[PDB]
Amino acid sequence: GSAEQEPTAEQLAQIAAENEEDEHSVNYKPPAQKDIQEIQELDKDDESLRKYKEALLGRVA
């Protein structure tokens, strides 16, 4: 919910890569696109909603 130059949605645009750069990338290239693993695995038996905010809140950690 925003409409201006360089919007907060441009950080959150990373959401398509945030999960797929593991399950469709560790099979194709070495572990370097994500030094961490908790950011993606949050989706499972922890917090299936915190993950969607992290792509803006703290891209790397």
Partner: protein, 62 residues
């Protein structure tokens, strides 16, 4: 195809930034290295544990 959950791409995977954390290998691989990453062995620091529930406007919004 619609086999995954709904995922926002907008147009770019890291517009003058990066997708997640493009950095060198720290200690080894992440897959099959240490079980319980979700909650069974929840690490001291790695993610943003900022809230337990209700991600704003049901997905993201603040």
């Amino acid at each position: 195809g619609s086999k995954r959950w709904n995922s926002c791409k907008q147009n770019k995977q890291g517009a003058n930034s990066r997708p997640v954390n493009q950095t060198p290998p720290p200690e080894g691989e992440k897959l099959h290295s240490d079980s319980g990453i979700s909650v069974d062995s929840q690490s001291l620091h790695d993610q943003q544990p900022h809230t337990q529930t209700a991600s704003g406007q049901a997905l993201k919004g603040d």
